CSV table of C-alpha atoms in Angstrom, one decimal:
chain,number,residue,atom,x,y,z
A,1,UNK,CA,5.8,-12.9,11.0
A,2,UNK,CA,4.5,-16.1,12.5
A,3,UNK,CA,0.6,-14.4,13.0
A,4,UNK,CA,-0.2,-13.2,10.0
A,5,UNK,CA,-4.3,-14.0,8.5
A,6,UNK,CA,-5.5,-14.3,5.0
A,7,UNK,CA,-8.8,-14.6,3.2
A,8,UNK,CA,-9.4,-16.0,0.1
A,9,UNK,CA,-11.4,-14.6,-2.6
A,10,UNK,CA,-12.0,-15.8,-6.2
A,11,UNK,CA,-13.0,-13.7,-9.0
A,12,UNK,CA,-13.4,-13.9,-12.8
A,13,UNK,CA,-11.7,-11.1,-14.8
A,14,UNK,CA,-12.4,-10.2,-18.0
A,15,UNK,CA,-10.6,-7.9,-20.5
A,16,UNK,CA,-11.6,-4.2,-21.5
A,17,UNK,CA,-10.0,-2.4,-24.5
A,18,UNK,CA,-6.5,0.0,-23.4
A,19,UNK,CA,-6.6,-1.9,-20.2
A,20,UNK,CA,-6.3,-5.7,-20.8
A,21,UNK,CA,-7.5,-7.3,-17.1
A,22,UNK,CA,-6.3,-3.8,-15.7
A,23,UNK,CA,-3.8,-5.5,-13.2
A,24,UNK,CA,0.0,-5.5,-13.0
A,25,UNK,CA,1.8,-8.5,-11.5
A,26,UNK,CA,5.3,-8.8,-9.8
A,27,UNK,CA,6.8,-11.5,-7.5
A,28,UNK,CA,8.0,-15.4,-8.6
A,29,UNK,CA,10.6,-17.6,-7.6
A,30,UNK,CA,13.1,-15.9,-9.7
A,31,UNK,CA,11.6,-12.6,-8.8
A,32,UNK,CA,11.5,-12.4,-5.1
A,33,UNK,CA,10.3,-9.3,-3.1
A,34,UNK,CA,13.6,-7.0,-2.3
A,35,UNK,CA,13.9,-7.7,1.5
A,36,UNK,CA,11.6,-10.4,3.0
A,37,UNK,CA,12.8,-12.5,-0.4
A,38,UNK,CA,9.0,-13.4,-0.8
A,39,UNK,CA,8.7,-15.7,-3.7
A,40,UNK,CA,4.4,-15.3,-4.2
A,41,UNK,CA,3.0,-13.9,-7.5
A,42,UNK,CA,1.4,-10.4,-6.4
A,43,UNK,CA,-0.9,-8.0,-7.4
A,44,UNK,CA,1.0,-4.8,-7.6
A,45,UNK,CA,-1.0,-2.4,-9.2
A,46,UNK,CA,-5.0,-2.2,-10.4
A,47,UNK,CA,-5.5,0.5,-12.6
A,48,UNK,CA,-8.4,3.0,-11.9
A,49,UNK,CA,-11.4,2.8,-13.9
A,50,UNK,CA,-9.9,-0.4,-15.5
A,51,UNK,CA,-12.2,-3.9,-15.2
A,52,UNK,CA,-10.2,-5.2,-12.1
A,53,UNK,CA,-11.1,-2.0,-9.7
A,54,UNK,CA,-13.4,-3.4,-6.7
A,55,UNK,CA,-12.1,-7.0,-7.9
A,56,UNK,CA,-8.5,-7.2,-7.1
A,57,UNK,CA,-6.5,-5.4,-4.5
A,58,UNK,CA,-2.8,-4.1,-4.4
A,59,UNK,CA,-1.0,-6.7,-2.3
A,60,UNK,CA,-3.2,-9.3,-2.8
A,61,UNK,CA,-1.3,-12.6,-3.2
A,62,UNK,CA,-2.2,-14.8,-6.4
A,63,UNK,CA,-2.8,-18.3,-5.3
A,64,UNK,CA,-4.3,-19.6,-8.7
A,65,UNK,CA,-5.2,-18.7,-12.4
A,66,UNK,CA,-7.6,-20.9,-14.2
A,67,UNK,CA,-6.8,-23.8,-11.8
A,68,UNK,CA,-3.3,-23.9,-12.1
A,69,UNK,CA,-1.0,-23.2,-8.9
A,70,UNK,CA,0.8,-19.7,-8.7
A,71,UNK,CA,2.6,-21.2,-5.8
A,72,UNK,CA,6.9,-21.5,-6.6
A,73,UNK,CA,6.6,-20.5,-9.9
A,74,UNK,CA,8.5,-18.4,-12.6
A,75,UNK,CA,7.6,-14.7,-13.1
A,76,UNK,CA,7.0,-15.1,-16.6
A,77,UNK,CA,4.9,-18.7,-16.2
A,78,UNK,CA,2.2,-16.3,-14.0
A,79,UNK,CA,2.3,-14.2,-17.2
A,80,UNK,CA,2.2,-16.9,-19.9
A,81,UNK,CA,-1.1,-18.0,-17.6
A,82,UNK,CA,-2.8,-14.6,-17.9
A,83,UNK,CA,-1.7,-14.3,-21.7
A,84,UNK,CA,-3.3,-17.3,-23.0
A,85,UNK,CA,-6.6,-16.5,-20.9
A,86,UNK,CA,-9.6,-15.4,-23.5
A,87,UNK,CA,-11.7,-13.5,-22.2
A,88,UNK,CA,-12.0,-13.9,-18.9
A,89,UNK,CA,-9.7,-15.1,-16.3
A,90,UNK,CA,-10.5,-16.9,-12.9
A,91,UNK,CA,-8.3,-15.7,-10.1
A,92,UNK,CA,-8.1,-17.1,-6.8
A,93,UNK,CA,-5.9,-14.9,-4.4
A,94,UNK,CA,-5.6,-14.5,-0.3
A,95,UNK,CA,-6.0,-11.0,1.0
A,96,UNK,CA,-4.6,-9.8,4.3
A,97,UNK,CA,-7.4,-9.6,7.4
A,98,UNK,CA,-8.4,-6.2,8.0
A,99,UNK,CA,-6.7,-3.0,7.6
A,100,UNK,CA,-7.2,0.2,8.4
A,101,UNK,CA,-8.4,2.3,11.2
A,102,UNK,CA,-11.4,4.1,13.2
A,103,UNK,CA,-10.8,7.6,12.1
A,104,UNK,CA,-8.8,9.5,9.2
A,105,UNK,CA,-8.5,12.7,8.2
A,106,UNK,CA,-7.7,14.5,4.7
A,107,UNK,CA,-5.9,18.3,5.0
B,1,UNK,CA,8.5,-8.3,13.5
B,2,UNK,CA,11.9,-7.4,15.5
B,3,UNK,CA,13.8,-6.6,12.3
B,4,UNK,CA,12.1,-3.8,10.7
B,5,UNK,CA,14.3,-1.3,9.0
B,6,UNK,CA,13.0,2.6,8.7
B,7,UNK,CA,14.7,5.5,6.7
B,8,UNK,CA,14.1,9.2,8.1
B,9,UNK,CA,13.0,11.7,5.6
B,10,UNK,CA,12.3,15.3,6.6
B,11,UNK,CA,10.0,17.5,4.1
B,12,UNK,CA,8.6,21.0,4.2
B,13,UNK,CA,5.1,21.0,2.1
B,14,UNK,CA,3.0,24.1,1.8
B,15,UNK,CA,-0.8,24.2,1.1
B,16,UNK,CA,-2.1,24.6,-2.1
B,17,UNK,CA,-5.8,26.1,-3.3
B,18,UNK,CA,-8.5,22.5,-2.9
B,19,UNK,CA,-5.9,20.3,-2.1
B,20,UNK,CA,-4.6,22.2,1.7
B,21,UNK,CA,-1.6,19.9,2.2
B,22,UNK,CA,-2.9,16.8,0.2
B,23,UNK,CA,-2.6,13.9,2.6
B,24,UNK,CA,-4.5,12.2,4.6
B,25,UNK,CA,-3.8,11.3,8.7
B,26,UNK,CA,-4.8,8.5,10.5
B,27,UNK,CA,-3.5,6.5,13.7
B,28,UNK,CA,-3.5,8.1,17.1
B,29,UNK,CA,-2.9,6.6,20.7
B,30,UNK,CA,-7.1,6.8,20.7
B,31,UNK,CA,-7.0,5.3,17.0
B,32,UNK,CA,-4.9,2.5,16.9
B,33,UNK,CA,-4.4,0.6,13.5
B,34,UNK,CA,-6.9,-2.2,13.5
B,35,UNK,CA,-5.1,-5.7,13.1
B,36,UNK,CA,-1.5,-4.7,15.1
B,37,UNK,CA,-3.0,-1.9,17.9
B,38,UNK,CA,0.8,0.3,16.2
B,39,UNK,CA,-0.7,3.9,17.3
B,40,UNK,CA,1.6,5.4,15.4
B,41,UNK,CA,0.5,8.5,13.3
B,42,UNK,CA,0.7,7.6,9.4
B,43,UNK,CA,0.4,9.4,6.0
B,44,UNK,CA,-2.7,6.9,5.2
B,45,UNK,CA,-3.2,8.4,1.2
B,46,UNK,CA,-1.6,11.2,-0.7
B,47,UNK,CA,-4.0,13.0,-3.1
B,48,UNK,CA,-3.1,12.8,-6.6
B,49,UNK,CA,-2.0,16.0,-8.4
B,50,UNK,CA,-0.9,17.8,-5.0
B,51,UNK,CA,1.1,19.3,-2.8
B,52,UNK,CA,3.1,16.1,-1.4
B,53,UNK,CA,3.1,14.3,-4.3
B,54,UNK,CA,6.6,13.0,-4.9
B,55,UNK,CA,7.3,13.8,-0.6
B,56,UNK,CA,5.4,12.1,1.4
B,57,UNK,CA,4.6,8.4,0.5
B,58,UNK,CA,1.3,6.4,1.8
B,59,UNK,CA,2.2,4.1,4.8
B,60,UNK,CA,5.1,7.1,6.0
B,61,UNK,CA,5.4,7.4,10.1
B,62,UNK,CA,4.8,10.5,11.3
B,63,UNK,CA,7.7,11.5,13.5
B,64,UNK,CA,7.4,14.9,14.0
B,65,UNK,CA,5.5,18.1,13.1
B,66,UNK,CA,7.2,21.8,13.2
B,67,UNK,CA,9.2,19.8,16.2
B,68,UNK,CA,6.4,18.7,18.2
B,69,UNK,CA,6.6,15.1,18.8
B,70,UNK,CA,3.8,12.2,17.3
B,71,UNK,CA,4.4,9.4,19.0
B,72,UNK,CA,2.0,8.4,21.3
B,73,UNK,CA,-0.6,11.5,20.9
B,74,UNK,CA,-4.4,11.6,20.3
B,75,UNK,CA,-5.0,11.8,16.6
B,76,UNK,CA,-7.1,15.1,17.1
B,77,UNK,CA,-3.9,16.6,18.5
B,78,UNK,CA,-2.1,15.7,15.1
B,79,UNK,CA,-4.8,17.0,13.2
B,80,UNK,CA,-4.3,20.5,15.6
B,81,UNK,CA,-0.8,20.6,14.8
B,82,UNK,CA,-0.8,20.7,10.8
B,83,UNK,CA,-4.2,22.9,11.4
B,84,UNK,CA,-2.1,25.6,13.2
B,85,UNK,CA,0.5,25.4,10.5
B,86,UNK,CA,0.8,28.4,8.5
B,87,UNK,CA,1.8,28.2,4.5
B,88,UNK,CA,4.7,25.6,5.6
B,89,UNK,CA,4.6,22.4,7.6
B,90,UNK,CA,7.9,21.0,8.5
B,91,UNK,CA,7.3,17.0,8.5
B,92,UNK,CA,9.8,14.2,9.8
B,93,UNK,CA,9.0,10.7,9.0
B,94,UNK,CA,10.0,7.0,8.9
B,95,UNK,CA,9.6,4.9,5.7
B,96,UNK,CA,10.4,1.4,5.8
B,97,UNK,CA,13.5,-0.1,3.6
B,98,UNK,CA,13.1,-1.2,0.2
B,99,UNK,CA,10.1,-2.4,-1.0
B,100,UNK,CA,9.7,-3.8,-4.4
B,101,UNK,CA,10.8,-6.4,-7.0
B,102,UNK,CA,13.1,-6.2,-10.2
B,103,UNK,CA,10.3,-7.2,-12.4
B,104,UNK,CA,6.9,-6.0,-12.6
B,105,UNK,CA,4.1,-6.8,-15.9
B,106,UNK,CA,1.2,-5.1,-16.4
B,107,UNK,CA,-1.5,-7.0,-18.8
């Protein structure tokens, strides 16, 4: 759509044993999302209990890692980025505004 | 957007002992999703572990319950009809198209 509002957020990762950064990643040029044919690197999946829970959201779009542009790139350069972080990894990613609603019930 | 794509999927889930049916419901002509105002009811989470695990899906439209009609009702009136239900809710829903990429990486 043609409305849509992000916010930023940076964070700094860092890596706990059977978890790495606790995040999987999907998207790239060469990767795109199945029907809009989005091209951004995405958060797909943050494990629970792993060191990325509260940091990272699914869906949250990856801008940059360690200052270099997520923006038009390969799937596997957002990987080699993430691979040849030590132990920590600075993340900067836009989030969709809001979500949600008033009122939910669980049965 | 205007070229949305859903996929109708009809379920029958029955309760189980601390899970009831395991989802959750939010939405509601009273309890409109924040950002769009879509009043739609939705499955809004799907415990882990029960009943509709592997039926229902988070983000599913509710269409229709036992054959009464969601669209444009109060969420309490939702709640009412899966309340009401006996062991067995009949559920018809919408879940949009797709979704996904070929590659995902978890690290």
């Amino acid at each position: 759509g043609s409305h849509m509002i992000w916010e930023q957020h940076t964070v700094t990762l860092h890596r706990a044993p059977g978890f790495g950064f606790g995040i999987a990643i999907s998207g790239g040029r060469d990767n795109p999302h199945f029907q809009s044919g989005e091209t951004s690197i995405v958060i797909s999946d943050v494990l629970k209990g792993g060191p990325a829970e509260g940091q990272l959201q699914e869906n949250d779009r990856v801008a940059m890692v360690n200052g270099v542009s997520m923006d038009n790139v390969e799937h596997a350069f957002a990987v080699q980025q993430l691979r040849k972080s030590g132990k920590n990894a600075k993340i900067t990613i836009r989030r969709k505004k809001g979500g949600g609603w008033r009122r939910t019930t669980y049965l």
